[PDB]
Amino acid sequence: HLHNTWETYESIGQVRGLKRLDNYCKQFIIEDQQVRLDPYVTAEDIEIMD
DNA sequence: CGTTTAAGCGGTTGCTAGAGCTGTCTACGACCAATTGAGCGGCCTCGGCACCGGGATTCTCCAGGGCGGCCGCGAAAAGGG
């Protein structure tokens, strides 16, 4: 956990665990921007998720 | 293969169902004798189907009566010597 690297998809290539990064990206990015862009969002939900 | 989730194990807390044991008794079924009426075989008779004799009903055939055609036949009109 000290050799954690800030990487990019073109900087990785084809290694094991790439679909872990894919699942992370799709899940966090899609419902993060969904809860940021929805009109039916209360302040309580955004503060508990923050 | 990544992720979630529910199985598995251990734990609570009280009550109730159920197995096991002991005890009592009472209705219920085995058992026996006398009896008799429901089952099995035969015997008799009717309902219905069928066979036979008799009578009524409709179809086919043979003969008589009348009419057409032939068979030369025979009386009669016209021509010839």
Curated annotation (Swiss-Prot):
Transmembrane segments: none annotated. Disruption phenotype: Decreased sensitivity to the cytotoxic effects of 6-azauracil. It is found in: Nucleus. It comes from the Eukaryota. ATP-dependent chromatin-remodeling factor which functions as substrate recognition component of the transcription regulatory histone acetylation (HAT) complexes SAGA and SLIK. It recognizes H3K4me. SAGA is involved in RNA polymerase II-dependent transcriptional regulation of approximately 10% of yeast genes. At the promoters, SAGA is required for recruitment of the basal transcription machinery. The 2 chromodomains are involved in the binding to the histone H3 methyllysine at position 4 (H3K4me3). Present with 1620 molecules/cell in log phase SD medium. Belongs to the SNF2/RAD54 helicase family. Component of the 1.8 MDa SAGA complex, which consists of at least of TRA1, CHD1, SPT7, TAF5, ADA3, SGF73, SPT20/ADA5, SPT8, TAF12, TAF6, HFI1/ADA1, UBP8, GCN5, ADA2, SPT3, SGF29, TAF10, TAF9, SGF11 and SUS1. TAF5, TAF6, TAF9, TAF19, TAF12 and ADA1 seem to be present in 2 copies. SAGA is built of 5 distinct domains with specialized functions. Domain I (containing TRA1) probably represents the activator interaction surface. This is Chromo domain-containing protein 1. It comes from Saccharomyces cerevisiae (strain ATCC 204508 / S288c) (Baker's yeast). The gene is CHD1.
